[PDB]
Design a protein around this ligand. Sequence first.
Ligand code: HEM
Ligand SMILES: [Ca+2]
Ligand SMILES: [Ca+2]
Length: 390
Amino acid sequence: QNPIQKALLNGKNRQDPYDPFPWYEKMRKESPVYYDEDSKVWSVFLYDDVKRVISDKDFFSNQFPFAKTMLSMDPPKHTRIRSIVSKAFTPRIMKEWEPRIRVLTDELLGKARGRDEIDLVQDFSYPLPVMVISELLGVPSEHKEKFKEWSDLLVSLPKSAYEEDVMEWRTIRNKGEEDLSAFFENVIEEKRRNLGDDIISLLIQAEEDGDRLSPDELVPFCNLLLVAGNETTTNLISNMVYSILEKPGTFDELANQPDLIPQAVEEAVRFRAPAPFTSRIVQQDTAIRGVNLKKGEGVIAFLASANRDEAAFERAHEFDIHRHPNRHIGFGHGIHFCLGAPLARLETKIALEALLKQYSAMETISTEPMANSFMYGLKHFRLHVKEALL
Ligand code: HEM
Ligand SMILES: [Ca+2]
Ligand SMILES: [Ca+2]
């Protein structure tokens, strides 16, 4: 009964979970502005139209009939909520974490030492972002396995459009949401008279010291930062290593000149971002490519398709660490531009620097994709590895 969910189940989610890209190409070329008659929802595939839908707030609203987070809010309230944490997520504040993120990354590859096969996701790309986001928020990272279980549910989709699968899915997801929410409620209660140098303390101060934040928006805020904080960066690390190993010689280029890694992270955000789409609702009649959109019509904006648009990028289908002019919209565009982009850039850089120093070779054995998800990425990534001579 969620039209956006139905539209994903009718389109995106009918494609290979780790290879939606031929489908995006087909839509770009044949139906770049597509009405799903079943769901009553538009999809846009081309760079200029996706970029406009996500940024043109005069016409495209974030607020539908996580619901109580900045993600689902329009100005003026959006500006006040985002400003609570805007300063805390700046490149310069996240730079203070580079030492701690290096240590966490080191410790994980430490524990992998002496193994000829690793599960990148279980051993590395899941634990590091869950641990960093736990320490930033101010919760114990010893809960990472439960955090991962809850996060995977909160970004999941039913296995099909079939009412029984949707109901089964609603039950399990709702239970995840209840238990994660109870968790944060317990954390808040504890932190109110034991504040830390941490983001949950910042939120509590905003709710307690004035009316910047409602009591019913603390736990939503926690859920959003916990879940985004790991589901995005986990899948961006995994997807980036996969992108590198897919293109022979890329591994050795980056290892031989690690100053390229920041560019290669931007290329991984263009090429295999963890967030392939976002959604808007039309709040004012408009047109894209002469197609008329009416107030109240939902729109899915395929960032992943925009970032592969032949019209916007040369060799858009190629992973090119040397992309000189890359103006990807993989973090979004305009007022909802990813709050975590600096953290994500910093974690992914450090993750990849570590892997390229630790391993002189890595080869894919198997993967299990994130199927039935809002996210694009890997549940498992088994690799044969050879540790470098030091
Ligand atoms: C790792 C790669 C990441 C990608 C590709 C990514 C992508 C996105 C995109 C496209 C948006 C815009 C959504 C929209 O316009 O509707 C967004 C928003 C956001 N992301 Fe990220 N994200 C990443 C990492 C993170 C991290 C690590 C966190 C938390 C630390 C985070 C927290 C957020 C929040 C809170 C918003 C909402 C901003 C707002 O509504 O004003 N993201 N992200
Ligand atoms: Ca709203
Ligand atoms: Ca208050």
